[PDB]
Design an enzyme around this catalytic site. Structure first.
Site, short mmCIF file in Angstrom:
data_model
loop_
_atom_site.label_atom_id
_atom_site.label_comp_id
_atom_site.label_asym_id
_atom_site.label_seq_id
_atom_site.Cartn_x
_atom_site.Cartn_y
_atom_site.Cartn_z
N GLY A 132 -11.22 -13.09 20.07
CA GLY A 132 -11.92 -14.22 20.68
C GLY A 132 -12.38 -15.30 19.70
N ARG A 153 -8.59 -18.82 16.99
CA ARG A 153 -7.63 -18.35 15.99
C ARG A 153 -6.24 -18.70 16.49
NH1 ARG A 153 -11.36 -14.47 13.01
NH2 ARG A 153 -10.19 -15.50 11.31
N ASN A 166 5.64 3.68 -1.89
CA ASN A 166 4.88 4.87 -1.48
C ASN A 166 4.52 5.09 -0.01
OD1 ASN A 166 2.83 2.78 -2.03
ND2 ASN A 166 1.35 4.44 -1.73
N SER A 191 10.58 -2.12 -0.34
CA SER A 191 10.97 -1.77 -1.70
C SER A 191 12.47 -1.44 -1.63
CB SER A 191 10.21 -0.53 -2.15
OG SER A 191 10.72 -0.08 -3.39
N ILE A 192 13.25 -2.03 -2.53
CA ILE A 192 14.68 -1.79 -2.53
C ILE A 192 14.93 -0.33 -2.88
CG2 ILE A 192 15.32 -2.04 -4.94
CD1 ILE A 192 17.04 -3.55 -1.81
N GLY A 222 13.46 -6.89 -6.18
CA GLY A 222 12.42 -7.65 -6.85
C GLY A 222 12.40 -9.16 -6.79
N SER A 242 1.83 -3.60 -6.87
CA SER A 242 1.09 -3.57 -8.12
C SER A 242 0.46 -4.93 -8.44
CB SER A 242 2.02 -3.16 -9.27
OG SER A 242 3.07 -4.08 -9.41
N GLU A 261 -3.09 -6.36 -1.49
CA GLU A 261 -3.60 -5.00 -1.62
C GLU A 261 -2.87 -4.55 -2.88
OE1 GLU A 261 -5.77 -4.46 2.20
OE2 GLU A 261 -5.53 -3.16 0.44
N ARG A 294 -0.33 7.44 -4.26
CA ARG A 294 -1.15 6.80 -3.25
C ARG A 294 -2.11 5.81 -3.95
NH1 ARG A 294 -4.84 9.07 0.32
NH2 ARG A 294 -5.40 10.39 -1.48
N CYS A 295 -2.13 4.58 -3.46
CA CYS A 295 -3.01 3.57 -4.03
C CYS A 295 -4.45 4.06 -4.01
CB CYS A 295 -2.93 2.30 -3.23
SG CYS A 295 -3.55 2.48 -1.54
N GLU A 393 -3.41 2.21 -14.30
CA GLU A 393 -3.16 3.04 -13.14
C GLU A 393 -1.86 3.78 -13.47
OE1 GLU A 393 -1.06 1.59 -9.70
OE2 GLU A 393 -2.47 2.58 -8.36
#
Ligand SMILES: NC(=O)c1ccc[n+]([C@@H]2O[C@H](COP(=O)([O-])OP(=O)(O)OC[C@H]3O[C@@H](n4cnc5c(N)ncnc54)[C@H](OP(=O)(O)O)[C@@H]3O)[C@@H](O)[C@H]2O)c1
Ligand code: NA
Ligand code: NA
Ligand code: NA
Ligand code: NA
Lengths: 499, 499, 499, 499
Positions: A132, A153, A166, A191-192, A222, A242, A261, A294-295, A393
């Protein structure tokens, strides 16, 4: 297979998956081999589109897709997504098998991901809680008297969904769902490395009625994708990957709506009053699930003096009693890592840790090009900060354990990594928890549980190097939607009498 | 002056304004002359900070400013902003004079801007309407049963506010206000062209109690600012300027929270049932205000066959009866353009229009290096699209007039420019208006009034080349704030009994 | 029948429907005949519960029902409602037949109501848009510094749903749905006039899994229900009925949460720029649908001088070309009125109108004890206000037509009735429409359409004598839910540092 | 006095306060003496209005007040309230003195109430956070396709504010503020016991510019007010008082918008991990503040076995070390109770407690007709439930202390009283706290603090016998406002293309 019966081409014994060009499956670009981390063997090939086909696809998405998506009313969009959920659900085993094979995902994890994708699709109805608009009366300022505003919106148009390896199935379905539910067209670029699940999902969506010219699946490796991100017909870029690629993406894309993300690991803090059984269990799982790929995997464990010993002891036992190997065996707890490189880096990172004063408490043994044991490395607070495992990481089932004096040090150490995706806190004291919640610089904090984004029932996303913006049921609207303000002027028109 | 008594240094007869380095006014970088568009004369100098001072300033903002801003409770932040409003209000004439002199803004416009800045500051209380968080019960999914979520907003830290020359005072106060009200520290980087008003505002804020280490004013020319945007201590960049610079900013900045208000002009549509007196009056004003140096200035007028004649006639009369000259005269309706270049471009753009079949209906005469007459160029629909005045944003008091058959053509032509900031629609029929509102690809549509962002009582921002995200009371929170999700796990804890 | 196979008892050739006593179907109170308005014949009997059973039922609802409803997680509640939608949908013909027979509802209307009930049940997912709570940071006041608040919704417990005769199926399903979705137990008390559809719906819900002790269906005539309303175990009363009964209900109930949908008719205004084809069509339908036995039926038509003639002409033609008679014929446009009394009152009201200067423009002929023609009575503005048809709600297919000079008079006359449920406005001018929207004292205004609450996609409810509070998807939460505020005190606890 | 210079009439040595009749101060009804609880002496007289004046006042409020309030834009309403805050603030000592004298309120409490009233007035700006409306797109259902909705809040008209004696100033200012900020007219009916503060506040509001015909202050004793509540021109009744009167009010009022804050006491629970210093301090204060004449006063203390002893010990010490007497002495901690009757009841309630096994741990001594010592009576769990102090609300500084085995028993006992206003919980464990928050049937729970509604920064209100609906900044909008839904029909109009 079955769902893809007319799509896949068996050329020279290897199934050849074509790209979906917003209308027809095809592609006349280089062919690329898709391998399994289970045995490094080629299980299929994907046809990348030519520059001419990329260009043509974007043109279709922009000139027609935006409208097909937008002009399909929401009630119908919801029907499409529910139908797609049904198709995927009846083809569950097929979806899971491809995940196990293509991603090296343990059977139970692969099944869980298919189910996550199905649920996400079925709960698209919950995304409407943030749909809304706002009505702004204008008599709260003199300059706006006899004026009024409506804020709504509107879909941005073409959203480029770039997905990581992943969670090849879910991420693609998630981005497509929230992008589509609001009226956007979508270019999915998986992801290729493991693009097969996306192709299957896109087919289920097309079979479900998803406007054929409003979606595209491009098998581009990529930097081939940069051409999509940098294009002006692409109004938004939903990227999960990443930090380094995310950075490149924005720099190539320029001004545009983004959701980034960017993962990184997550620290877990255990207060002295924590239920250590729950903590050890959740932390162990947080460290090893899907071989730490896993992120939201736990990469650092911080525990106050009084429980550090038991906690680290229990997590060690749990990680040690895990069965590694081939993911096809429902016996295995941990399958392989996506590539021998990922294992190389993990081994190097463990050596670095050991050299800087770190001590392996579990695992450490590489079992093959793509297999390794979930490793837990203890490290003294005064040296951990310079360890590669802390600073970076390491996308693998590996976490550091660090004893801390109190909450402030735990928090300080937790905030010392360059990332800020999630953080976990096990404990019961409301004050210490509230302090932690306030000071942890992360998009999300999980109290008494391991970090798990699930299907995004709760919004998540990063701080610092972990990115910007959030994904989640309802909240993702902000990334694929733009506001539209309509101001009405009734000055002197007699609607109001000085008010 | 007065407010800046101890700050300004009169070196060699010209007041020298130093940068504010998050603690102390100073700067040891090159000195730069600030000129008036009224007479091309140097009215002051600003001291740019050295690379070492920029670096030091960022370090202070990041290490201490974030905390000074955040740790000052909102109730006190509001007191600071209200006090600053009082200081600026009592120094109104001084603020206005500098606007008239430094920006070439007509006295009434300069006074209006000071008042806008004062109001913005006083209404910071209204920004709280979007401050609360969300509580998400977890029993609407099986996987989240006995779980719960709290979603809150948190300040990002250091916001870089980059401001344009056309609203040197307001833009700086606006960005500082919404950035600060939520707990952020701020680096203001004003147009090196007219940075005096920002310095005055920042001083009023510092006098009002604004945490001295939570704000910085850096007099850096163009690309010198890149160093700020590209820095990781800068979590958000609120930029109002041209599309081209905005693009460069994101490419330099990379992943980060952005609000990009990139202007471009605005089209105005007049339906056959419009009150033409209101329309002509608002459109004329929309074309000439501040010599068209308004991002929301009208650049294109589209009117349906039956009213085109009268409408264009009236607007022409109104533009012609305008008094141009020096802005110090409260007699003048239109002052100068910020630079001789801006006039050059406008003249060239008018010639281009004429060459492509366009005909001047008012103005056209350049009156000096920085003075020109508000120009209204008529153009046939079949040729306007290739005219520079249509394709680009000519930052000057110049608009095109184009007769159209119906709403669909008006809409099509309105959407044909690369920008999508605002659009105006004069008419009374709800259906035609609703259609226009749906199809105009702009951040905001003004019904029966000229586009006027005012203080942001109603949110505004761009679509297409006009940028991304919105500014506005309440809505700006999205650009300088990040969400923080806290998920509580009570599984098996006995809070709920299977629910 | 089928759905009610084990429930209904065929005693002496007439199906005997028992009450549902929150656990078991039964009842040992007086038996009451249910008649059809189609032929005044007894089609069934309902067993009313004894005072002892009412008391016992309430005790179960309160002691166990509240918990069964609340302790069933929302995800399961949604499954129950979706299952119930499926059961009703597969038994559509049976549901419709009972509506046609028991309510005298034309076949298409009866089918539409069953479908409305089914949709309402399936869209319970949309009710979640208003389910989340609020998080209130405490640093915006000095007294609340280092404090924080969470505001949540909680079910009230036992909601008494009292329903009218004109929508026996939908109203009961609607109230049960919004009451249950939020975790409440429910006592449904249908009109003793046509309680069969409710019994069928409640059975479908019980078959779908609705907690057996969380729902009750009591066949109590009028004042027998007071015992339920006045009981303290009843935390809320959702009542849809006449103003007079609504008044009695609150006076019997005392302090409690209420939603009072008290109908009355609706006025329709036609501006000179209205599409008269659309207007006449919608108005005619608004006048006659279900023989005007709709709370949102049009009872007064106000049209500006210039279109009054044509408009009233067209509506007259349309009302005249209607087929009255038995509702079983899919040929019939209008079935009977619920009772001979309702027709008596309508006839008397028409005479009153005629005596006061009114003139019948269509209809006027009574066709039997329960049959009448849709009547349209013209009346002069200076006399209409004293006419029974204006002053009161004559629940029948009858409306007044009144010519007016302008919008102000239309508005004044529209606001002159004691009711304020909905109002309709046909016209295109945004200003006149905005004025009307501001000045009409009604819960809802329908622009360019007849008033139709539908399933409550848009919230509706009354002003003045039409009641208080609203029903609607999402909005009904306010009537069956209570807020719960949790304030956390962290003063001096070190969470914040003076902020 | 001063503020009331021209209003008050000194007839026969006693200031005579007239009623404010929506335009002029006056009244020709019986005169009534206002006494001080400090010495039972008459300190003034109030003129009640005649039936004719009540009727005339309502007529003015309804015919003109609604419009004066509504037609004053919000920006001006806010100015009125801010001005009134200034007037009251500069007359603080005068306002406080009257509170001390008329209500027997200790000086610090009287000062705190004046400040609460001032703050409430100044923060009216925060009430706007709940002012905007909702925009509902219609394409999420087939029946509403090409349709759209706007939901807005509208003032109800005339709100009757009935206020209690324990917060004569604040309650009146609070109700007037939230009623007025949204555009309503208001009839204030203060406790005839201490109506002087309301008269002073209303004068400050009138001096501040409050529309003279939009407010009324009627000095009517008890049932004389029924005439106002039962009147149809009164669209809403905001009542704060006892359950019994609240019940009578709704029964007299019938269908109408209500907010019923009906008090009762509050239970406080102390978990074994609570900071007992904080708990004892807050609980003691919660028991005695304003001689327990606070709806949110603590009336029952429940503490788990392990801390019961110390906790009850500390609270006893604190209550015992209190200074009782005349409130004029800033030395006194506790002034008198509003009437000798209130003390009588408290004494009787303490005897009842003792007879049923209860033991006084502090206080118990009556010190005069209106003076008593804050009493703390210990009671065994197995007998407390039948004690008058538990079953009823004894409006006096008296609480019961009950030792409990665990949280479940504390919760059970806390929920055993017929009231459900607030509850307090001291402890640190998140799980036990969450359980308590879920199971306590109260409008508000205070974690680690005594219950304190303050100015309503956090919404509050009752459950069970404590009433219905909430008051609070922002939330009170629901009680004095009605929704208005505007549905726009664009079916077939070409706005959308099947969507
Ligand atoms: N969308 C809106 O709401 C809105 C509102 C007002 C104005 N505008 C638009 O913005 C423009 C205003 O005029 P303007 O001439 O001042 O345009 P601008 O040059 O694009 O303004 C740029 C701002 O960015 C700085 N800058 C320039 N190059 C930079 C770089 N490479 N890196 C970082 N910062 C850099 C400028 O400083 P220097 O002065 O040193 O170059 C100036 O402060 C117009 O196009 C107008 O339409 C848009
Ligand atoms: Na770009
Ligand atoms: Na960067
Ligand atoms: Na009652
Ligand atoms: Na009444």
């Amino acid at each position: 297979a079955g769902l893809l019966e007319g799509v896949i081409k068996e050329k020279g014994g290897v199934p050849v998956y074509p790209s979906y060009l917003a209308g027809e499956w095809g592609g006349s670009g280089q062919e690329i081999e898709v391998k399994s981390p289970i045995d490094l063997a080629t299980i299929a090939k994907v046809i990348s589109p030519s520059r001419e086909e990329v260009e043509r696809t974007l043109d279709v998405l922009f000139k027609r897709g935006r409208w097909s998506a937008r002009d399909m009313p929401g009630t119908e969009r919801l029907a499409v997504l529910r139908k797609a959920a049904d198709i995927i659900e009846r083809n569950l085993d097929v979806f899971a098998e491809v995940l196990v094979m293509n991603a090296g995902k343990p059977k139970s994890a692969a099944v869980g991901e298919v189910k996550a994708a199905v649920d996400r699709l079925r709960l698209a109805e919950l995304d409407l809680k943030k749909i809304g608009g706002d009505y702004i009366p204008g008599d709260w300022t003199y300059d706006t008297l006899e004026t009024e505003g409506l804020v709504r919106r509107e879909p941005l148009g073409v959203v480029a969904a770039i997905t990581p390896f992943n969670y090849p199935l879910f991420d693609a379905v998630n981005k497509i769902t929230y992008s589509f539910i609001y009226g956007n067209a979508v270019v999915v670029k998986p992801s290729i490395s493991d693009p097969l699940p996306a192709a299957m999902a896109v087919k289920a969506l097309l079979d479900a009625g998803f406007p054929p010219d409003a979606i595209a699946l491009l098998n581009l490796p990529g930097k081939e994708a940069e051409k999509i991100v940098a294009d002006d017909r692409v109004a938004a870029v939903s990227f999960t990957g990443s930090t380094e690629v995310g950075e490149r993406v924005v720099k190539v894309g320029g001004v545009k709506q983004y959701v980034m993300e960017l993962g990184g690991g997550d620290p877990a803090i255990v207060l002295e009053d924590a239920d250590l059984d729950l903590a050890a269990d959740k932390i162990a799982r947080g460290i090893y699930s899907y071989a730490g790929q896993r992120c939201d995997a736990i990469k650092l464990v911080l525990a106050e003096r009084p429980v550090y010993g038991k906690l680290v002891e229990e997590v060690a036992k749990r990680l040690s009693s895990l069965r590694v190997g081939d993911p096809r065996d429902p016996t295995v707890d941990v399958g392989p890592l996506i590539s021998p490189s990922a294992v190389d880096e993990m081994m190097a990172a463990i050596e670095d840790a050991v050299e800087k004063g770190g001590r392996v408490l579990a695992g450490g043994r590489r079992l093959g090009p793509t297999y390794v044991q979930p490793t837990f490395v203890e490290a003294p607070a005064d040296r951990v900060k310079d360890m590669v495992l802390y600073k970076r990481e390491v996308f693998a089932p590996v976490a550091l354990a660090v004893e801390v004096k109190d909450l402030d040090q735990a928090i300080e150490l937790a905030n010392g990594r360059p990332y800020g995706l999630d953080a976990a806190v096990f404990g019961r004291d409301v004050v210490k928890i509230r302090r932690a919640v306030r000071l942890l610089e992360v998009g999300a904090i999980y109290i008494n549980d391991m970090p798990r984004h699930g299907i995004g029932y709760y919004p998540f996303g990063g701080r610092k190097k972990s990115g910007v913006f959030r994904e989640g049921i309802g909240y993702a609207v902000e990334a694929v939607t733009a506001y539209k303000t309509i101001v009405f002027n009734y000055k002197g028109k007699g609607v109001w009498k000085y008010e």
